[PDB]
Amino acid sequence: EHTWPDKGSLYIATTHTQARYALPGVIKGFIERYPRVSLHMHQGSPTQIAEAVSKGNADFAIATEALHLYDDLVMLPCYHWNRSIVVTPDHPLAATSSVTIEALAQYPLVTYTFGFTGRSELDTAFNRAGLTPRIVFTATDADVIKTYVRLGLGVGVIASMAVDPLADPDLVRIDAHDIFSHSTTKIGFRRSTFLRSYMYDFIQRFAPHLTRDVVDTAVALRSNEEIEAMFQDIKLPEK
Amino acid sequence: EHTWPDKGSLYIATTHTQARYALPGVIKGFIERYPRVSLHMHQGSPTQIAEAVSKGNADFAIATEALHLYDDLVMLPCYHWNRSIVVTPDHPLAATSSVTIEALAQYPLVTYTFGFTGRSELDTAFNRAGLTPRIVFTATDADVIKTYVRLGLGVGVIASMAVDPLADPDLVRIDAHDIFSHSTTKIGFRRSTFLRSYMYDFIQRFAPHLTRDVVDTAVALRSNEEIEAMFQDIKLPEK
Ligand SMILES: CC(=O)OC[C@H](N)C(=O)O
Ligand SMILES: CC(=O)OC[C@H](N)C(=O)O
Ligand SMILES: CC(=O)OC[C@H](N)C(=O)O
Ligand SMILES: CC(=O)OC[C@H](N)C(=O)O
């Protein structure tokens, strides 16, 4: 019954983690209220996602920091998230509170790979601690990482949202927000892109704080740095 | 007890699907027989995988056809595989034998994206049938695709190995090898790369037909086209 007769299309370019763990709840809620809106989604590497929206092959770019290289157009903060190490229940780490930055580098690691979905930090957080960790697997997603944790190739380091008991209950979850700083999931779009009402509603559903007047004000400010500074005293969702 | 004291390293660059559904069985069997071999794995886009091995940041490149662009160095066929459409049990297709190329283009599609893991074929198989299918989601992996099939965004088209009952049992599997031609998973390496004994054993475990004398003969033939023609009368595994 509750249906908006809004006609139009919405092309979303994003990554695995976002489309896997952050998007599906929002996506199904969207198409159930906008049957006349043609929704198109494109998964790819974050460096290719920010190229789709610029060149007009996509409207929004829901990915992590990686859009910062592209000073091409508008960039809005959605939510913060942090990593969590996953180990077998038979692993020495499984038993510790709380693990530490130095105590994690003593094991083989299975993390994210450089640009896709949040890695450094890693290789880089360590640089800070002057550590040289042994990383034997750099994967794009977390479904791959956890499988090679069950295999025993090394200690996995994935997003917290990528772990849930009962979906993955033979694994051990350990918080590492004291170990690694949080990453900021952003949404990339253009000033030329006319923001439709179904677009505003989609953003505020993926990011409650990003209301129309908040979005418009951020667009009004002709700088991503000014936008990122507008939310200085404003708190974001933490996953 | 059964341990080879072979010292050395093995860097493998691959994709999601291979590392997800084809590699883990081989990987665990490898490290259990070569404890002194330092195994390193790198997941990435197929166009970036074939760049890792060339530039020496990886030894083997276990991915699909996409290595053909790179006439840089040796390319060995491992196994054939084909797609299978996944739908909800409440979907019209669920009920049909067997679906057909024309009868699939009448629905919204959720397939692989252009270069990563086997797409065209799609967009291209159709071209052949003069069809213009509505594809609303192009994803890198199949874990993403199936989630958006359960959501109901459209009909999914993934690898057959990406489906298994009891891992994904609320979905309906339909064979499409009569619909789409099979793809060839290849392994990319260099002639300069000295093939260690643990490397030969790894290949013949991932591809039974690729024994040492078969591998050496293919390397001896200084052309990938000659290699691909050597297996003309030789049958490959079919997944
Ligand atoms: C993991 C996740 O919940 O992502 C955040 C989501 N946009 C939200 O509804 O807050
Ligand atoms: C959703 C979450 O975990 O973050 C809460 C956030 N600090 C807020 O109140 O906006
Ligand atoms: C899916 C899969 O089995 O891949 C093929 C594998 N290399 C093999 O053992 O034949
Ligand atoms: C493993 C498979 O399904 O393929 C069999 C292949 N035709 C062979 O005999 O080599």
Side-chain angles (χ1 to χ4, degrees), chain A residues 21-22 26 79 161 205-208 237 239:
Chain A
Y21 307 99
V26 187
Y79 67 94
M161 47 181 168
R205 183 145 47 187
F206 187 83
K239 279 75 195 305

Side-chain angles (χ1 to χ4, degrees), chain A residues 20 58 135 159 190 203 217:
Chain A
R20 232 302 184 183
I135 302 182
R190 348 211 270 172
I203 301 170
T217 303

Side-chain angles (χ1 to χ4, degrees), chain A residues 14-16 18-21 23-25 27-28 31 39-45 113-114 134-141 143-144 147-148 150-153, chain B residues 14-16 18-21 23-25 27-28 31 39-45 113-114 134-141 143-144 147-148 150-153:
Chain A
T14 183
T15 66
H16 178 283
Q18 301 296 331
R20 232 302 184 183
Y21 307 99
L23 282 180
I27 296 298
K28 202 190 70 173
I31 63 177
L39 177 59
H40 294 252
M41 299 184 59
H42 171 67
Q43 152 156 14
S45 52
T113 128
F114 300 64
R134 184 167 66 261
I135 302 182
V136 294
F137 206 154
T138 64
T140 287
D141 58 291
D143 188 41
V144 169
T147 51
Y148 288 86
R150 300 183 179 93
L151 261 49
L153 192 61
Chain B
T14 183
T15 66
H16 178 283
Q18 301 296 331
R20 232 302 184 183
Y21 307 99
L23 282 180
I27 296 298
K28 202 190 70 173
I31 63 177
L39 177 59
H40 294 252
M41 299 184 59
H42 171 67
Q43 152 156 14
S45 52
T113 128
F114 300 64
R134 184 167 66 261
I135 302 182
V136 294
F137 206 154
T138 64
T140 287
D141 58 291
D143 188 41
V144 169
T147 51
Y148 288 86
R150 300 183 179 93
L151 261 49
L153 192 61

Side-chain angles (χ1 to χ4, degrees), chain B residues 21-22 26 79 161 205-208 237 239:
Chain B
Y21 307 99
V26 187
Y79 67 94
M161 47 181 168
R205 183 145 47 187
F206 187 83
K239 279 75 195 305

